[PDB]
DNA sequence: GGATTACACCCAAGACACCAGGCACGAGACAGAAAAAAACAACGAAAACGGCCACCACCCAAACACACCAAACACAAGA
């Protein structure tokens, strides 16, 4: 708790219960912790290996 | 080494320090530092033995001369 800075944020989130498919999608979500500090468009790109 | 990286708006969710060694006071012990005395240097006073002038005699130094040897112009030889 005392190291909230330098800790990953948003690893836990409030489950989305607006509709059923939103819940099913939130339970299957993934996150790359690149951060928005940086305009490198490469890791944002759909890649061949994503198939 | 720092410093900057769209603009506006909506919603939800959690916390809004707890707990542990330092300042003061709280008391011992060798070290930060102070007091003393005894073997350290010198100087005053007495004792007698080492130092200076005689006396003295035998051993080294100088003179005389010896024969002996090293040596130096030159009459002769020589290329």
XYZ file of C-alpha atoms (C1' of nucleotides) in Angstrom:
130
model
C 0.000 0.000 0.000
C 2.832 2.419 0.809
C 4.341 1.696 -2.625
C 1.238 2.598 -4.641
C 3.481 4.566 -6.960
C 5.821 2.188 -8.828
C 3.017 -0.401 -8.559
C 0.905 -1.581 -11.475
C -2.511 0.049 -11.541
C -5.777 -1.376 -12.837
C -4.788 -4.989 -12.215
C -8.146 -5.383 -10.451
C -11.285 -3.715 -11.807
C -14.966 -3.461 -10.930
C -16.776 -6.208 -12.834
C -18.909 -4.761 -15.636
C -22.499 -5.944 -15.127
C -24.247 -3.564 -17.513
C -25.221 -6.444 -19.812
C -24.295 -10.108 -20.014
C -21.864 -9.963 -22.943
C -20.011 -7.050 -21.337
C -19.443 -9.248 -18.276
C -18.299 -12.182 -20.405
C -15.858 -9.916 -22.237
C -14.514 -8.241 -19.085
C -13.760 -11.685 -17.687
C -11.606 -12.466 -20.764
C -9.690 -9.177 -21.066
C -5.925 -8.702 -21.342
C -3.632 -5.733 -20.724
C -0.174 -4.798 -22.012
C 1.329 -2.352 -19.488
C 3.165 -0.177 -22.016
C 1.497 3.005 -20.798
C 0.435 6.062 -22.750
C 3.710 7.907 -22.052
C 5.182 7.169 -25.467
C 3.922 7.355 -29.043
C 5.341 4.023 -30.250
C 2.548 2.713 -32.477
C 4.297 -0.648 -32.926
C 2.952 -2.473 -29.813
C -0.535 -1.152 -30.618
C -0.535 -2.910 -33.996
C -2.496 -6.010 -34.936
C 0.170 -8.618 -35.616
C 0.292 -11.763 -37.719
C 0.871 -13.958 -34.663
C -2.378 -12.645 -33.129
C -4.346 -15.053 -35.357
C 21.589 16.142 -15.868
C 15.841 17.921 -17.039
C 11.231 18.832 -19.885
C 7.268 18.348 -22.765
C 3.714 14.744 -25.063
C -4.826 17.058 -27.774
C -9.602 19.329 -26.222
C -14.378 18.988 -23.905
C -17.808 15.855 -21.152
C -19.950 11.371 -18.201
C -19.766 7.591 -14.488
C -17.900 4.469 -10.496
C -14.594 3.113 -6.339
C -11.273 3.588 -2.093
C -8.880 6.420 1.674
C -9.142 10.748 4.364
C -1.229 7.315 8.109
C -0.134 3.686 12.792
C 3.920 2.325 15.431
C 8.390 2.200 16.412
C 13.524 4.190 17.752
C 15.372 9.013 19.107
C 15.562 13.525 23.072
C 15.636 14.059 28.071
C 16.917 12.544 31.624
C 18.777 8.360 33.930
C 22.857 6.116 36.118
C 28.375 3.404 35.486
C 33.960 3.590 33.269
C 38.238 4.475 30.783
C 39.253 7.774 28.390
C 39.774 13.360 27.805
C 42.254 15.464 30.847
C 44.573 17.154 35.763
C 47.883 16.374 40.259
C 52.083 14.318 42.209
C 56.743 12.066 43.155
C 61.106 9.540 42.288
C 64.694 8.389 39.581
C 66.373 11.626 35.938
C 70.173 15.949 34.811
C 73.166 19.294 37.105
C 76.214 21.362 40.926
C 79.001 22.076 46.063
C 82.675 19.496 49.218
C 86.463 15.893 50.373
C 90.454 12.162 48.652
C 94.012 10.527 46.739
C 95.992 9.107 42.479
C 97.358 10.477 37.742
C 100.135 14.286 35.645
C 104.562 17.409 35.182
C 109.636 18.351 35.966
C 114.127 15.780 37.428
C 117.296 12.299 36.890
C 119.048 9.486 34.239
C 121.409 5.559 30.724
C 121.443 2.873 26.649
C 119.877 2.969 21.594
C 119.240 5.473 17.281
C 121.108 9.408 14.299
C 124.963 11.986 11.961
C 130.014 12.316 10.098
C 134.028 10.060 7.963
C 135.507 7.197 4.796
C 135.648 2.883 2.042
C 134.513 0.372 -2.563
C 130.624 0.063 -5.788
C 127.474 1.358 -9.059
C 124.485 4.432 -12.131
C 125.261 7.677 -15.529
C 126.624 11.350 -19.226
C 129.500 14.152 -23.424
C 132.031 12.523 -27.190
C 135.933 9.755 -30.325
C 135.266 6.465 -32.531
C 132.736 3.278 -35.187
C 128.809 2.533 -38.198
C 124.220 3.015 -42.479
